[PDB]
């Protein structure tokens, strides 16, 4: 399942955090793009 949860921070950034692999990236995976 897409464990990619997008947290939109008031800092003005939406980083996609994968709650399965504990992956935190500032660029949305191919699942989103």
Swiss-Prot record:
Detected in brain neurons. It is found in: Nucleus. It comes from the Eukaryota. Residues 1-31 form the WW domain. Disulfide bonds: none annotated. Transcription factor that binds RNA polymerase II and inhibits the elongation of transcripts from target promoters. Regulates transcription elongation in a TATA box-dependent manner. Necessary for TAT-dependent activation of the human immunodeficiency virus type 1 (HIV-1) promoter. Binds formin. Interacts (via the second WW domain) with TREX1 (via proline-rich region). Binds RNA polymerase II, HD and SF1. This is Transcription elongation regulator 1.
């Amino acid at each position: 399942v897409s464990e990619w949860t997008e947290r939109k921070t008031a800092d003005g950034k939406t980083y996609y955090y994968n709650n399965r692999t504990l992956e935190s990236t500032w660029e949305k995976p191919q699942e989103l793009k």
